[PDB]
């Protein structure tokens, strides 16, 4: 919701993981120091025409380090539903100069990963 980027839908059964040096969405207005953050999982409850609640595919939202719902979580703090990503050469500093997004101000950036990025099974745009 407050994320600057769109979500990464989880279609299969495995969770979102990235090897070291990958996972950070591309941001032209950010510096190589900024390319470091985390993802956060969210599930949805829908009510089909059957009148019965149904669970939809979980989605993951990127948040720069020190920002978002887990702004007070150090990098690497193990917690279910939160995974961490970083580009080699990025500082471990909360990027409050980037902040979160206000849905009344601008739209979410289309989450794009560079060519050569490895995505786990069940993850595709």
């Amino acid at each position, epitope marked *: 919701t407050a994320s600057w980027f769109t979500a990464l839908t989880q279609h299969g059964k495995e969770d979102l993981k990235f090897p070291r040096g990958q996972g950070v969405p591309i941001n032209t207005n950010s510096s190589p120091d900024d390319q470091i953050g985390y993802y956060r999982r969210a599930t949805r409850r829908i009510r089909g025409g059957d009148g019965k609640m149904k669970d939809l595919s979980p989605r993951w939202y990127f948040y720069y380090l020190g920002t978002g719902p887990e702004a007070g979580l150090p990098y690497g703090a193990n917690k279910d539903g939160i995974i961490w990503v970083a580009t080699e050469g990025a500082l471990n500093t909360p990027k409050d100069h980037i902040g979160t997004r206000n*849905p*009344a*101000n*601008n739209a979410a950036i289309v989450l794009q990963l560079p060519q050569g990025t490895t995505l786990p099974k069940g993850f595709y745009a």
Partner: antibody
Amino acid sequence: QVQLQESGPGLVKPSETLSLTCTVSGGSISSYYWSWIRQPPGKGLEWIGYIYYSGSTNYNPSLKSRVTISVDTSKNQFSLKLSSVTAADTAVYYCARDYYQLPMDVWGQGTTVTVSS
Amino acid sequence: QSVLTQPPSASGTPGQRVTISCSGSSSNIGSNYVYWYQQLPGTAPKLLIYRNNQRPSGVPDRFSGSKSGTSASLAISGLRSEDEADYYCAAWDDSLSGRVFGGGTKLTVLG
């Protein structure tokens, strides 16, 4: 249902500090953005700043040197603090709320504050 | 630019169409949403348009907004004497990291 109401001083000596607060009835602070807007008599609107989740802030850089906005989730209120007030700070001060994609969708009545000795 | 520039005044014949302009830079209009507000005398501003062209509930459908490039426009069809008010455009600014208003446009309905 949501209604806003500003309250505080109606007059503040120059070089002092303006301190207004806005009380939210009909809803909660929650995760919404709560702004402060001022308008001098006969002039245009000027955005001061807003506060939101985790008390995070954004200020107009023109007033950033002197402005401080706070929030109190318990009292369902948020306040404005403007220091070293000059005559250019005499205006009607509004509080507003950003409801997701609708910015400043609900405004308060606006309280008139004048800076004079 | 880093501010929004509107014409200071405008007027039109009732029952017809009139538009108000709003000029900005790539740091505000050229990159973020534009929203419009109406301020009747003695009252607080009222949201007319959000997300460039979306209408909140209660706003008459004769109000219409648009944006292209670094400019935005507010169109009012079927002008009515009750539309006589001040109109403000506003948008987020990445350079200032803050919200910026336009000067405002005095609308005068005739007849």
